[PDB]
Amino acid sequence: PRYLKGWLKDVVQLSLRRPSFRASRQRPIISLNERILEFNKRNITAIIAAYRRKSPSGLDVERDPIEYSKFMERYAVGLAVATEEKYFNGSYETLRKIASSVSIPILMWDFIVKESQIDDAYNLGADTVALIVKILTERELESLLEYARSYGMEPYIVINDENDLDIALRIGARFIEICSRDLETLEINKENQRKLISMIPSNVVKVAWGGISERNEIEELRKLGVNAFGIGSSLLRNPEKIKEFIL
Ligand SMILES: O=[N+]([O-])c1ccc2[nH]nnc2c1
């Protein structure tokens, strides 16, 4: 990984030691980036809802993951499931159960630093996995991106600044999350997010993530070319708010 500090250094050491999941996949790969493009063609707002318990950017929320996921199946373009253990109180078992209960695309949100975590994502039923430029070298990114593609997944490349966007372009990312939240400091900068969005070619599927809370900001971002919108805490507090974000 990269040289890191603070909680990101801790979570990378944890991920390096995380045991593998050793069962077989029991569902097809359902492409999230293609379903986003289909929603775009249907002029349906494409919302990626997240399930987590703890978060460095929120108070804990304890709710039933299956009631939540089955509700979101009716409205969301896909579901992100936070599986990191210490800072998100996530679990592979939770991802496994959600993936078995719904038929929309599932993104595994974790801090992927070794190929076995991609094996894990595949075997658990996730359709794609996040790769975070801030924690990986260019060599590691390209290797993990190629490894995920060899399973038929199109990884979800997470960027937060200009250096990250440069690396995402270098490595041939086709599916990019422009995250407004710096993971080291937890600060949000939407001006920087919009600058990055303006520098991404049209053929890349773009997801805006980070402090999205209002229908009007979705519409503004869609006008700038963003294809889909990620929303965590707001929907974890009140799932039914997604109906307003779409309608
Ligand atoms: O909790 N999440 O599933 C989740 C998904 C994507 C994100 N991007 N930035 N933070 C994120 C959190």
Residue 74 lies in a domain: yes
Decide: 90 in ligand 1 pocket, CB within 6 A: no
Instruction: Enter the tokens of residue 192.
Output: 């920087």
* Number of separate domains in the chain: 1
Closest Cα partner for 185 from 161, 209, 156? 161
Ligand 1: nearest atom to the Cα of 158: 8
Cβ atoms of 190 and 160 within 8 Å: the answer is no
Sort strands 228-231 and 175-179 into parallel, antiparallel or unpaired. Answer: unpaired
Phi then psi for residue 71, to 5 deg, are -65, -45
Instruction: Enter the tokens of residue 168.
Output: 């995402």
Residue 213 lies in a domain: yes
Give the resolution in Å: 1.6
Atom 6 (ligand 1) nearest CA? 109
Residue 50 lies in a domain: yes
Residue 132 lies in a domain: yes
Decide: 80 in ligand 1 pocket, CB within 6 A: yes
Helical segments of 171-228, H only: 190-197, 215-223
> Can you tell me the distance from the alpha carbon of 188 to that of 231, in angstroms, rounded to the nearest whole number?
14
End-to-end alpha-carbon separation of the chain, Å? 42
Amino acid letter for position 126: A
> Which residues are CB-neighbours of 199 under 8 A, at least 6 positions away?
162, 165
Q: Find the 50 Cα to ligand 1 centroid distance in Å.
A: 7
Instruction: Enter the tokens of residue 21.
Output: 């999941």
Instruction: Enter the tokens of residue 8.
Output: 């990101």
Q: Find the 210 Cα to ligand 1 centroid distance in Å.
A: 8
Residue 21 lies in a domain: no
Cβ atoms of 23 and 119 within 8 Å: the answer is no
Ligand 1: nearest atom to the Cα of 80: 3
* CA-angle at 117, arms to 168 and 130, nearest 5°: 30
Q: Find the 34 Cα to ligand 1 centroid distance in Å.
A: 19
Return the half-sphere exposure (C-beta side, CA atoms, 13 A cut-off) of residue 125.
20
DSSP string for residues in 16-43: HTPPPP-S---S----HHHHHHHHHHTT
Ligand 1: nearest atom to the Cα of 230: 6
Closest Cα partner for 140 from 7, 55, 15? 15
Decide: 82 in ligand 1 pocket, CB within 6 A: yes
> Can you tell me the distance from the alpha carbon of 104 to that of 126, in angstroms, rounded to the nearest whole number?
10
Closest Cα partner for 58 from 212, 233, 240? 233
For the stretch 69-82, what's the b/e string if a residue is b when 16 or more beta carbons lie within 10 angstroms of its beta carbon?
Answer: bebbbebbbbbbbb
DSSP 194: H
Residue 141 lies in a domain: yes
DSSP string for residues in 128-174: EEEEEGGGS-HHHHHHHHHHHHHTT---EEEE-SHHHHHHHHHTT-S
In this structure, is the dihedral angle defined by the CA atoms of residues 209, 212, 215 and 219, taken in order, positive or negative?
negative
Instruction: Enter the tokens of residue 147.
Output: 């490894």
> Can you tell me the distance from the alpha carbon of 90 to that of 81, in angstroms, rounded to the nearest whole number?
8
Instruction: Enter the tokens of residue 215.
Output: 């229908």
Q: Which domain holds residue 195?
A: 29-246
Task: List the CATH number of the domain containing 141.
Answer: 3.20.20.70
Instruction: Enter the tokens of residue 245.
Output: 């974000």
Give the residue carrying structure tokens 């070319």. 225
Residue 212 lies in a domain: yes
DSSP 181: B
N residues, the chain: 247
Residue 19 lies in a domain: no
Q: Find the 103 Cα to ligand 1 centroid distance in Å.
A: 20
